[PDB]
Amino acid sequence: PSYANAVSRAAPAVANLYTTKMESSLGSAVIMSAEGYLLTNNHVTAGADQIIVALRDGRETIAQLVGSDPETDLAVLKIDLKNLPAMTLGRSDGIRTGDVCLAIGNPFGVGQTVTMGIISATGRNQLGLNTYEDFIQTDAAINPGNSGGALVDAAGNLIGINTAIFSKSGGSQGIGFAIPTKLALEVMQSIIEHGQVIRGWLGVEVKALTPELAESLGLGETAGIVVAGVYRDGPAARGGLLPGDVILTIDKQEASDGRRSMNQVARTRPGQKISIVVLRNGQKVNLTAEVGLRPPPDGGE
Amino acid sequence: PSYANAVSRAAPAVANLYTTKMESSLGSAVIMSAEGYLLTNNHVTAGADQIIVALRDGRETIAQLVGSDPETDLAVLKIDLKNLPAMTLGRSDGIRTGDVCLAIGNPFGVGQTVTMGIISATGRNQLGLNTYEDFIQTDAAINPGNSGGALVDAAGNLIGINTAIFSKSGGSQGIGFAIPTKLALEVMQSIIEHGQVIRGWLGVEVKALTPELAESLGLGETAGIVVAGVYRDGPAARGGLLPGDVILTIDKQEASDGRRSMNQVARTRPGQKISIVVLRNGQKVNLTAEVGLRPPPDGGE
């Protein structure tokens, strides 16, 4: 049929980013509210000395950088303009593979461009682009210049911020990646509020069972987070875990997935303490621990 | 759903071009009428010593070159065959970004190929491929061998002639460009009639305000075509404009856009004269001028 109505709704709220540093770079950004806050990638505006925002209706203006979060590759901007169009929000949770989506951006500086595809996959982590990833995968053509633009559903509602691609040729081969809205709103709100995103710290480093040793004290591969390693300071080595310890629950929640344990720990405010039960030599042992702060640290492959 | 009905309507009127020069090249062409006239790109048939047309139903024949227009990258051909299928025409004006479209061509000589996408953008000029550009942008996969084939809407009606692509890899990365039908019919009809396209000549060369000097005698950036440069002969330097002059109206029409002024001047028949009012030192001055002829002069990036 036609996706023009979706385009008409959403394209006004997607902007072209021109940045100058010390040299010149292109990207995209999404207008989140009529008050002038804009969402984009960190690798678009990082180190810029000047950010110009060019809107679909032709106005241009310099943008102020509210703040940035490199661990998710997001950044926030504020512009002083009246009568701004604002993107409507979709539900990242409600999307399904095979749903149709639209990417809106400035690929190769050609101008605002709409590309069409489907959701290829949801929840892509383990990719190796950012510390925290819940990537939406799409086959809508996404190219250098699409960063920070909008991935939008068939009705025009924002489902993601286009950030990266996997490609052998430096341009689209049908495998592109967008940060889900629900994740991007979380990051956007703290930045707007605290100029950054505050995460919690915990020494432990973990891996899967690979259950030859874990076959010992055998279970169905249920609720076991294997521990390997510790770190230099503000450590969780002084709360009771050791290399080889295995964690059934963190803050009374299953350690089935090591990705989830990253998330809970980041969302626990710095300066607090917490309880983890790991299985040592065949019996549940109970620990409790503090919470440190996390220290400070489009894209191809 | 399915675009097969669209394919069934349109594909019979799209032909495979094989050309030999002095060596061998592939392209596509569109059958515009049952009398055997065919539309294609200039860079497909330019310098060919022999053009073969192969139709979907298997017939082949040598084509005669009616004429060509390199400034838009169009060419016209005539074949002697009976019972030719003819492409139906869509309205280039009525297309909207997000509308679905189909590209029909011979990419890499693989054979007639249908690809599907959306209109990514309309009215693309400033690209740097041709002197006169009103490009439709699509993300339907377009590759070398697609030149001169049909961009068609969801019902099968011709909206454009696929001509070029932007790509880092020598093949499709989702950014392809088609010449709108309405423009291609204009060029097609004079070629068929006068063996070429006759345009009008005028010395002036222009640019935008960049209103630091124009901020002087300030206006809203309204109806001002900045002049910079003049040319060697049949000049419009002998009608009254000078470097630095600024033009509010050409032939009683606004100079808001320098692209439009190119178009009016090309469409004014050679041997006539015309009136332009530019703003000199703060007051409207009125000039009038003659019209010279324009002298004589798929694609990647």
Place this chain on the structure above:
Amino acid sequence: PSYANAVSRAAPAVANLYTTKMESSLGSAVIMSAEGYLLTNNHVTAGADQIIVALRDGRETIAQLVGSDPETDLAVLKIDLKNLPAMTLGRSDGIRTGDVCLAIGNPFGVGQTVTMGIISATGRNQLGLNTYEDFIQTDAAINPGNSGGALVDAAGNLIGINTAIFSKSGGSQGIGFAIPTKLALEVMQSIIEHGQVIRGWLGVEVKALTPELAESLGLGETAGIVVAGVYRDGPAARGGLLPGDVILTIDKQEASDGRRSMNQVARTRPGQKISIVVLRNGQKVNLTAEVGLRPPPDGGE
């Protein structure tokens, strides 16, 4: 609209192939029946010393290789697992160019991936990838890692096994190729039964009229298979055909197309004999001949 329902139906029956040889390789495979038989490409599992099958629901298991057929680039596998989901079958015959289709695979090892396109063309032979080709062409993004996965119609029914691509860049440029289901079932059933595919042998090698000599004894290019060449042993040179002979019918069937004559001969069981009438010097001559066995012998361009 949305293809999610199609994805939900089909994706459970598409598996990720990891193979180790002597080193490591990725591909895809399709679960054809609840008894654990799987279809994939030959170039994915050929020479593997170990094949792991990873299902959408997370189970993994080593696969046994039933057998393989390199002349079509198909291979078959058997896994020992209960409650397997099974792909539903579409009709390769009923597909039309422009129909929507979905490709399901593991491109670049990113994980199970759904891409969307249309049927670009059907019946692609002469490509030069395999001896026997009836390729479905699609513009659904297909990349290295998609081999042996499912090309599926808009309702979720298998129409093809994704096997190859044409590309200048080592990744998708919109021209991908799937083996039709109807062909793949034929190959699958003999492999499952006889561990291989048994074809018949016949010396002759043929080409088109190119009717300068054939213009002699002129006909409409109807039912004429030109002969050129013969072979080393178990030949059909001892049944009566010679270089230059022209064949009107094979086994009382028209030689209009040399591709069809390949097919009839392969499908004639070894050890039998057959009748071919070729036109020699202007009169139909009738031969009859035996049938030899055929001897033994994702992908880019």
